Subunit: 134 residues, 6 copies
């Protein structure tokens, strides 16, 4: 029984795909443990979530996009939640994300990709404590 | 341009209809301005939310049901949000709720009806202050 | 808590709308208690099912249509199943059937209307005994 | 068996609701007989399409909106297409449009209402000749 | 033109995914030849359907689950129906079943996996004769 | 930013999957640049579109099927539109087209496969000029 951190990005709200994305996870039978809505995440919170990408050239545009609209932070719980939800998510690249996945079906840009999902146990614990410090 | 208070009831979670419901409101172009997830709402918030029904026969069952599962409290914003979302919601009674409405399509019980929505400007103001103080 | 008799008509199969129809009833929380697939219903079951229309002008076309493809007979159970599913069904006439109802959304002919549903306690009892003796 | 004129408005494109709308009509069994995509409809076609509203207060905003994005003009054919598709469409006013209708479900503005549909035999004949001469 | 045996398992009825599953097959354009509804399959009928798994450690739980609710037995017919419907079904394992498949989209357990589908010509003939002895 | 040619084939209209197919592309966020409806494409226009398959044994049946009903020609525009829409389309073969793709989900025949999509830059330019000579 694992717990994973998921972010509904600003492009979801702009395109009205919020329920679509959450429904795909809900239908997979994953249970919401914690959920927080942000009218606008603080840039610092974002920079922390993506601290691994600070040296990348897209870092600043990435941070700019993540504060350009509302965000929903969610902790999903279930057996092997981390890897499973990653597979539902789909590849970061629009040239690779398979049809049937969230990105494969709905995302068309490598930056604006609708959804974040922790990629491992270590980073899950880490990202859960960033969005739900309590 | 109004704001209304919406509750996603425990039966929505039990039946995995959370996204479905929020989806029907999202497609009508209403924007979220506040949202909070309750693994279990405090008994007293529920009793105050339904303070008007405190002397009604179903009151106790109504509250028991409201704390029997998680709920989501949501403030929706849009032009004439209150009356419009009430329209989406559908009648409390399964015998009167019209197909195409949330309850008319999905709900089959007068008590377990999936969704709450403020019924007026004044009540919306109270209910909003109850869940987001 | 009632039981009602539902027929999935041949035009549902021709248009691949079988799951769609059964889906709208399933989402309303009604449970199946009996189900039988007919690659071709016997002419006499049809004529008895519609025994009330035997002297009507459309009777022959109605029966011809009912045996022109497969059908599914289903007994649904739920609190007030008869009136509620009738509501989901929608008016026989394409001019009167409301959007959000099965026929109102999907059907476009007074004869080929996709679905049958008992219209009362008494008729439901007969129709159920016709298809599941 | 009638033919009616349908316009898929710019807000359908902006909100990616094009397929959704055309889908609701396709499921009702109406067939396309003519279709044309306009990256930007000519101002004069719009003003003639709405020639009846030329003296109304909203006329200018209505036209500005109609040329602010792409549109799709479609001739639909089916038995009683005009009145039926009008029914699918739903009331112009967000306060009156019923859930289950196109506008009632998706639209939230009296001006930006996603879809146009001829309102009579005579008007359908004019509107059809305007977009497909 | 092949015929294959399909079972809608008890978890479908509990979660109200019956129409969802059948609709995915219907949209693929497969035709129903035979269909039987069981309020509760007899354990023996189940033990026969899974006679190959009698020595497995999950056999008894498997049988217990299969009689815990209603079941729909269906014979679908179409060109290469057996292999095609298997691919729609998706892997038994939730760590493998791909998004876009029935299990990949809706199943989250290796036991409660919503749907059975014959895996070959031999077993199809065999399973069809178990549920439709006529 | 590429442009690709897409054809909604006669089997889509017969089965009422027109909106379904276009919606999958629309949700992927591809923009319609040009669109033409044909009550019946001229056989010659079809023979040109498939001039590469003139020596194949299915050529004539292919052409017969393509004029057996209405067709919608569409130019979609977007980054890498050609390869992406191909992946949404799915393999020509029903034994290969993956679930989650258009053909994988809806097509069950190798001939009647619902949708055409240019396979490269060269053929896109070529097919766009066939259906939209202007
Ligand atoms: O070349 C890239 C790689 C990533 N990102 C953005 C998108 C992604 O959501 C975020 C973090 O990258 P990742 O962790 O590799 O993506 P994922 O979200 O798939 O883990 O950085 C880019 O804009 N360009
Ligand atoms: O006879 C009744 C009436 C209402 N309720 C419950 C359901 C409803 O959600 C809540 C409040 O009732 P309401 O405000 O009259 O209904 P609505 O929620 O439609 O405003 O009380 C019952 O259990 N039994
Ligand atoms: O003018 C008519 C009326 C009815 N029927 C067919 C359609 C209907 O399914 C069946 C039985 O009619 P009904 O019981 O009056 O309609 P419903 O099925 O809505 O109860 O007869 C016609 O073909 N023409
Ligand atoms: O008060 C109004 C009434 C109408 N319109 C626009 C919306 C409508 O699409 C168009 C034509 O109006 P109509 O023909 O009366 O509405 P409908 O489109 O429902 O026939 O004018 C407005 O902007 N404001
Ligand atoms: O490790 C396992 C393997 C299988 N099963 C159950 C699920 C499956 O539905 C049934 C038969 O197994 P299978 O034939 O290998 O699965 P499939 O249904 O994918 O053919 O046994 C388990 O509970 N645990
Ligand atoms: O063995 C075959 C191969 C192809 N075709 C038809 C289907 C296809 O749509 C068309 C062109 O073939 P293709 O370009 O290889 O298919 P695709 O549309 O996947 O590019 O010829 C057949 O009928 N049989
Ligand atoms: Mg990562
Ligand atoms: Mg109240
Ligand atoms: Mg009758
Ligand atoms: Mg007008
Ligand atoms: Mg097996
Ligand atoms: Mg090719």
């Amino acid at each position: 029984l694992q717990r994973t951190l998921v972010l509904i990005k600003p492009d979801a709200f702009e395109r009205s795909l919020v329920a679509e994305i959450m429904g795909r996870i809900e239908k997979k039978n994953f249970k919401i443990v914690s959920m927080k809505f942000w009218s606008k995440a603080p840039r610092n919170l974002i920079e922390q979530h993506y601290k691994e990408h600070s040296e990348q050239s897209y870092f600043n545009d990435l941070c700019d996009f993540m504060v350009s609209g509302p965000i929903i932070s969610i902790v999903y719980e279930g057996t092997d939640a981390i890897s499973k939800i990653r597979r539902l998510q789909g590849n970061t690249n629009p040239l690779a994300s398979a049809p049937g996945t969230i990105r494969g079906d709905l995302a068309n840009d490598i930056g604006e990709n609708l959804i974040h999902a922790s990629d491992s146990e270590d980073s899950a614990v880490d990202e859960i404590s960033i969005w739900f410090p309590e």
